Amino acid sequence: KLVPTLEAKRDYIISRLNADFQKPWFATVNGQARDLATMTYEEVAKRLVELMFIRSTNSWFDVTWRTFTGDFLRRVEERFTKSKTLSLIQSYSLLDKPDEAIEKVFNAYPAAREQFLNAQDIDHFLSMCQNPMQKPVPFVPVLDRRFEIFFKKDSLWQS
Amino acid sequence: PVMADLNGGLQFVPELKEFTAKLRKELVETSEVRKAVSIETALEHKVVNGNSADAAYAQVEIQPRANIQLDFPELKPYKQVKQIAPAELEGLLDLERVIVVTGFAEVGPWGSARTRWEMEAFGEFSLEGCVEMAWIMGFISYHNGNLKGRPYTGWVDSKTKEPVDDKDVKAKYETSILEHSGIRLIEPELFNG
Amino acid sequence: GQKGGQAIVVHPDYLYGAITEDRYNEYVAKVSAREKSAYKFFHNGMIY
Amino acid sequence: TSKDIAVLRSKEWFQLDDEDFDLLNKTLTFETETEVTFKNANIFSSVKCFGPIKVELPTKETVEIGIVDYEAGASHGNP
């Protein structure tokens, strides 16, 4: 009954996750919500920085999350590029000025500003959210048979 | 009968055999010594400085992935199209009465209508055409989760289930995809004997 | 059986010359959204 | 071969008395004695390498030709 009750309360529980919880519903653009497959690559990036990069310290919260965000731009370019080229991100250390490491890629493939995620770039994004040996992601990416793990894993340091 | 010596004068350069055999015997020396000297100095550079910092110079180079498309018609802005049609056309047609194709598809000897227009217009398959003809011929499958423990997410063999990238699919399959598509000697097991 | 048949197709862009502007770019935004959604659905199904 | 006698003097620490020495079909031995000064567990600070180069005579009695002469700071091994 888990997946179905999550089906009926979907619009509801994500409103609450956005309103009153630590790890918000990830797929939320400009206040209005959506799913991972409704969010464009550019939005995925511009949100990953909103939740994994600290503007006040101007520093990533972890090298693990910066590695996450980098391995994501890796496929972003792996998809939209036509032939084999050199990475626009050669060491993720470039992400230390993020809003420009974004433009650097999303000017090399302006298409990823308009087209949603390819579906193989969703389950990858998820297998990167449940990768061991990395700090769990500070948001909720999806509702499925692992929802509470996503919901209350490593939920102490936040204080 | 005429002879027509279209020879540049190669009957004059004397003892041409080894004069030739020397010119190339030198081009292998000057080639191979700069093969051997170059690799060891690059190898010298790896023991005084170590490859721990020399690996950051090995740049990361990305393989394109297959991103199929739907080929929707592009819509140029309104000023462009109000120009191509006669200016008097607007307000002049009962649009309820203008038929218009809105979708289309196909199942031919070349797969869908996207992967026949390739061997039709372009004579050969793209990457997005070779992955689709790989998927609709049951060569490659999908997989996400954990195979070999490691999380694999992407195309895989379908017979051996062993991971395969969309950059090594055109090399690995394009031979058979084209071997078994289009007008062919009739394969009996497609027609139950 | 002597069934012939000849159908001709015109280029779609001659159509939009027959509609008012605000309606066109209204339709334009409308397709833009459907295209993305169709992209999404085509890839989920193709995968699974 | 003849292309190794090139890669040899292609090197800076390989020097002889007469670089014109006929190096083909000869047999070169390297009785070298190296020094090293550390600055970390692995990052050297100063490496020296020296020791005569000898050649097999037709009597196979080794006779010196030149001297290995290497020195490098901040190495990571010995080339």
Ligand SMILES: NC(=O)c1ccc[n+]([C@@H]2O[C@H](COP(=O)([O-])OP(=O)(O)OC[C@H]3O[C@@H](n4cnc5c(N)ncnc54)[C@H](OP(=O)(O)O)[C@@H]3O)[C@@H](O)[C@H]2O)c1
């Ligand atoms: N008795 C009490 O009153 C009390 C009170 C509070 C907490 N606790 C206990 O103390 C623990 C505190 O941890 P938690 O609950 O905050 O964590 P958690 O939500 O239980 O999740 C921890 C898991 O995430 C992974 N992980 C966490 N940080 C990581 C990092 N920096 N790098 C790589 N992987 C990381 C770990 O994987 P690995 O398997 O790779 O490590 C670990 O299995 C709890 O598990 C709880 O049982 C007890």
